[PDB]
């Protein structure tokens, strides 16, 4: 309900005085209840030593810069990054969903005592927040763009011998109530160097945890946990920047195939996914070294537009909204071209096409009663 | 000693603290842009032409047999004239990494107002130095032969003792002197008993037989050594010989800029005196046969924007010209976020 401490204490004391009994709780009880849920409270362990990672297990919020170089004689940067530790956040999420996974495994006709390993498929996401400034007046002082970095446990699976069975599935994966945040900072999405400097420790922790084994004591007995990370929560603007490809000016448009814009208009359906992180690193190394000593254009079309070095293994994906808006935007021009009788008119005029558009809009508004607009949506 | 404001073009966001200004036949080339090379300039080098107090950024392409390199935010450049070319070592990858490859940048063609570079890479063998930034490398001549003298700066923690909460923490490198032979890529380290701790963001001046180390900052003690160094080197036919001596006359300066005014006479500009206050005093060094004498200038007046700021950067333009940059004040909220000025050394 977005209740502050002072107002909550006022409500508590008012209800306690008007009722006599202590129905609500004091402030220290609420502080204990919120500290028992924050990351860095319950103990855990890892079967591998997890090199380059500390073994301390009572740490929570930390500075996201991870030992910055803010001295005056260094590259200037004005950001405030606060983050949780990856393993601590995962342990906290597991201790939170302990009851849910217990209920799920009880409903799935399984024993109350059953060790792991629990295959935990986790979704990864990252996106900015636009404008978060709170300046009432005094003109547009600063844009003050922010950015976050969050994860979401997608599913949990367990097996009984050889047969696997999905023991936990999220009801709403792409929702707001299941966004577990790792890091929060105030930096522009286009700011590459600061974003890399902030996200490098998290990527290191993730690649070190990819091949580890967590051991927890949540259900009174030792439970083992594995993890599988999938970075599918990246939009096009960020997946065309963190992967090394050009942002928008490249002829290559497919983030899965190496087909140019010209070849895409000819070959429609016959394609395949020919992109990965290792091949992108190889293409960047070839671009940097250039052992063949070729021209710039041929080297560019040989590296398929790779110019920057990728550092985050991403798994791109699309949604239905973009597909349907693209299909409708194409069909709109198809209707214009078929109503303008262009198959018999080789070269028309822009004013004639605008007249066609106006006539089609009026006919549609008169028959179907629809409001045309250039700004397209879903 | 005359301040002069310079107006910037449209691609002003490509300028970041710690760029590089190379000189070729009087023409200045800008290197070390911000981010990654876009579709306009796939290389990253530009012509830093300035007319009527207005600078332009015209891209420059490489040769067919060249090699594309990523931009660096704190490299080590030295004027190696043995034709004319430059040698870049160190730097900082835009992905917050440190590269330890030597890039040989030379001009292979210049006609019809168009230039052409032949940037190639060269590896190191033997006592290879760890990847680092902020260091300065020079070339010294002896017995008709040339040799590269490099003094280390600072770098990240070693992979063995590196953790997550200190993933970006850095420290000064080991105080060693490395001799790099560009004829075969052979590096050899040398230990000196007079060197106590590391040093970063210093000034390196050499006249054909000895590199002078002026100013600098030490991270281990968070202070600035006020003692200069005199590294007398010699390259005999057999084993090399290097000697270091301590002499009075140092200046507590860090991140200073060095340029040449007259023959064997350089000038130091304001860097950073203390970690909190701003340095404004500037000194000039005059060389002779073996001695060295320092002196100040006639306190050139600055503008209000420079005195009211806190940090800045810049470099030299070769022909006695210092190009510095002042960040825009957020209080005005109407600025290009980076002011730029120039100083006529004369
Ligand atoms: Mg987005
Ligand atoms: Zn495709």
UniProtKB/Swiss-Prot annotation, chain A:
Effect seen on changing residue 252 to A: Deficient in both nicking and hairpin formation
Recorded consequence of changing residue 127 to N: Loss of cleavage (both nicking and hairpin formation)
Effect of residue 124 to Q: Impaired cleavage
Consequence the record notes for mutating residue 87 to A: Loss of DNA-binding
Tissue: Maturing lymphoid cells and central nervous system.
Stated consequence of mutating residue 234 to A: Deficient in both nicking and hairpin formation
Disruption phenotype: Mice display a severe combined immunodeficiency phenotype. The have a small lymphoid organs that do not contain mature B and T-lymphocytes. The arrest of B- and T-cell differentiation occurs at an early stage and correlates with the inability to perform V(D)J recombination. The frequency of homologous immunoglobulin pairing is much lower. No obvious neuroanatomical or behavioral abnormalities have been observed.
Domain of life: Eukaryota
Mutation effect (residue 287 to A): Deficient in both nicking and hairpin formation
Residue numbers binding a divalent metal cation: 127, 235
Post-translational modification (record): Autoubiquitinated in the presence of CDC34/UBCH3.
Subcellular location: Nucleus
Consequence of substituting residue 127 to A: Loss of cleavage and strand transfer activities
Stated role: Catalytic component of the RAG complex, a multiprotein complex that mediates the DNA cleavage phase during V(D)J recombination. V(D)J recombination assembles a diverse repertoire of immunoglobulin and T-cell receptor genes in developing B and T-lymphocytes through rearrangement of different V (variable), in some cases D (diversity), and J (joining) gene segments. In the RAG complex, RAG1 mediates the DNA-binding to the conserved recombination signal sequences (RSS) and catalyzes the DNA cleavage activities by introducing a double-strand break between the RSS and the adjacent coding segment.
Recorded domain comment: The RING-type zinc finger mediates the E3 ubiquitin-protein ligase activity. The NBD (nonamer binding) DNA-binding domain mediates the specific binding to the nonamer RSS motif by forming a tightly interwoven homodimer that binds and synapses 2 nonamer elements, with each NBD making contact with both DNA molecules. Each RSS is composed of well-conserved heptamer (consensus 5'-CACAGTG-3') and nonamer (consensus 5'-ACAAAAACC-3') sequences separated by a spacer of either 12 bp or 23 bp.
Family, per entry: Belongs to the RAG1 family.
Subunit structure: Homodimer. Component of the RAG complex composed of core components RAG1 and RAG2, and associated component HMGB1 or HMGB2. Interacts with DCAF1, leading to recruitment of the CUL4A-RBX1-DDB1-DCAF1/VPRBP complex to ubiquitinate proteins and limit error-prone repair during V(D)J recombination.
Name this polypeptide is given: V(D)J recombination-activating protein 1
Provenance organism: Mus musculus
Gene it is expressed from: Rag1
UniProtKB/Swiss-Prot annotation, chain B:
Subcellular location: Nucleus
Main localization, broad class: nucleus
Molecular function via GO: chromatin binding; DNA binding; histone H3K4me3 reader activity; phosphatidylinositol binding; phosphatidylinositol-3,4,5-trisphosphate binding; phosphatidylinositol-3,4-bisphosphate binding; phosphatidylinositol-3,5-bisphosphate binding; phosphatidylinositol-4,5-bisphosphate binding
GO cellular component, one term: nucleus
GO-annotated biological processes: B cell differentiation; B cell homeostatic proliferation; B cell lineage commitment; defense response to bacterium; DN2 thymocyte differentiation; DNA recombination; mature B cell differentiation involved in immune response; negative regulation of T cell differentiation in thymus
Traits of the deletion mutant: Mice are viable but fail to produce mature B or T-lymphocytes. Very immature lymphoid cells are present in primary lymphoid organs. These cells do not rearrange their immunoglobulin or T-cell receptor loci. Double knockout with TREX1 does not show a visible phenotype.
Domain of life, per lineage: Eukaryota
Cited function: Core component of the RAG complex, a multiprotein complex that mediates the DNA cleavage phase during V(D)J recombination. V(D)J recombination assembles a diverse repertoire of immunoglobulin and T-cell receptor genes in developing B and T-lymphocytes through rearrangement of different V (variable), in some cases D (diversity), and J (joining) gene segments.
Family statement: Belongs to the RAG2 family.
Protein name: V(D)J recombination-activating protein 2
């Amino acid at each position: 309900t977005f209740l502050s401490c002072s107002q909550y204490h006022k409500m508590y004391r008012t209800v306690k005085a008007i009722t006599g009994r202590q129905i609500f709780q004091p402030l220290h009880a609420l502080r204990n209840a919120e500290k028992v849920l924050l990351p860095g409270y319950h103990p855990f362990e890892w079967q591998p030593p997890l090199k380059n990672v500390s073994s301390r297990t009572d740490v929570g919020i930390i500075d996201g810069l991870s030992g910055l170089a803010s001295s005056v004689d260094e590259y200037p940067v004005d950001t405030i990054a606060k983050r949780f530790r990856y393993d601590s956040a995962l342990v906290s999420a597991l201790m939170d969903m302990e009851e849910d996974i217990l209920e799920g495994m009880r409903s799935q006709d399984l024993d109350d005592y059953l060790n792991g390993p629990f295959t935990v498929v986790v979704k990864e996401s990252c996106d900015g927040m636009g404008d978060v400034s709170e300046k009432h007046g005094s003109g547009p002082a600063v844009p003050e763009k922010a950015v976050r970095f969050s994860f979401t446990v997608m599913r949990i699976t367990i097996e009984h011998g050889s047969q696997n069975v999905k023991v936990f599935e999220e009801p709403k994966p792409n929702s707001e109530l299941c966004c577990k945040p790792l890091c929060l900072m105030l930096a522009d999405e286009s700011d590459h160097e600061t974003l890399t400097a902030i996200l490098s420790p998290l990527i290191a922790e993730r690649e070190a945890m990819k091949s580890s084994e967590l051991t927890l004591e949540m259900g009174g007995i030792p439970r083992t946990f594995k993890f599988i990370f999938r970075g599918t929560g990246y939009d096009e603007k960020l997946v065309r920047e963190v992967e090394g490809l050009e942002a928008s000016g490249s002829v290559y448009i497919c983030t899965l195939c190496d087909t140019t814009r010209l070849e895409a208009s000819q070959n429609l359906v016959f394609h395949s996914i020919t992109r990965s992180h290792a091949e992108n690193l190889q293409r960047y190394e070839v671009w940097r070294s250039n052992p063949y000593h070729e021209s710039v254009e041929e080297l560019r079309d040989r590296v398929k537009g790779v110019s920057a070095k990728p550092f985050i293994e991403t798994v791109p994906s699309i949604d239905a909204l973009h597909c349907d808006i693209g299909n409708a935007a194409e069909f709109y021009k198809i209707f214009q071209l078929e109503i303008g009788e262009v198959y018999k008119h080789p070269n028309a005029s822009k004013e004639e096409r605008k007249r066609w558009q106006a006539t089609l809009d009026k006919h549609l508004r008169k028959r179907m009663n629809l409001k045309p607009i250039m700004r397209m949506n879903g | 000693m005359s301040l002069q404001m310079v107006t910037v073009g449209h691609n002003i966001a490509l300028i970041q603290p710690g760029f590089s200004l190379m000189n070729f036949d009087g023409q200045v080339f800008f290197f070390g842009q911000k981010g990654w090379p876009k579709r306009s300039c796939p290389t990253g080098v530009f012509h830093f032409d300035i007319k009527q107090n207005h600078l332009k950024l015209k891209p420059a392409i490489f040769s067919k047999d060249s090699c594309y390199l990523p931009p660096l935010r704190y490299p080590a450049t030295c004027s190696y004239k043995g034709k004319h070319q430059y040698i870049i070592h160190g730097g900082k990858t835009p992905n917050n990494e440190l590269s330890d490859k030597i890039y040989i940048m030379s001009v292979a063609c210049k006609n019809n107002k168009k230039v052409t570079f032949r940037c190639t890479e060269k590896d190191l063998v033997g006592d290879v130095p760890e990847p680092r930034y902020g260091h300065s490398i020079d070339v010294v001549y002896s017995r008709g032969k040339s040799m590269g003298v490099l003094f280390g700066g600072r770098s990240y923690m070693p992979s063995t003792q590196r953790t997550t909460e200190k993933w970006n923490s850095v420290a000064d490198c080991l105080p060693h002197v490395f001799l790099i032979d560009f004829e075969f890529g052979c590096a050899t380290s040398y230990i000196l008993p007079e060197l106590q701790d590391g040093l970063s963001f210093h000034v390196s001046i050499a006249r054909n037989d000895t590199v002078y180390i002026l100013g600098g900052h030490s991270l281990a003690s968070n202070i600035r050594p006020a003692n200069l160094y005199r590294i007398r080197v010699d390259l005999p036919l057999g084993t090399p010989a290097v000697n270091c001596t301590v002499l009075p006359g140092g200046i507590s300066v860090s991140s200073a800029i060095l340029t040449q005014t007259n023959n064997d006479e350089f000038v130091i500009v304001g860097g950073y005196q203390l970690e909190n206050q701003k340095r404004m005093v500037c000194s000039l060094v005059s060389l002779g046969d073996n001695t060295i004498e320092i002196s100040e200038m006639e306190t050139p007046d600055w503008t209000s924007d420079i005195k009211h700021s806190k940090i800045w950067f810049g470099s030299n333009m070769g022909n006695g010209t210092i190009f510095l940059g002042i960040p825009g004040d957020n209080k005005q909220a109407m600025s290009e976020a980076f002011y730029f000025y120039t100083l006529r050394c004369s």
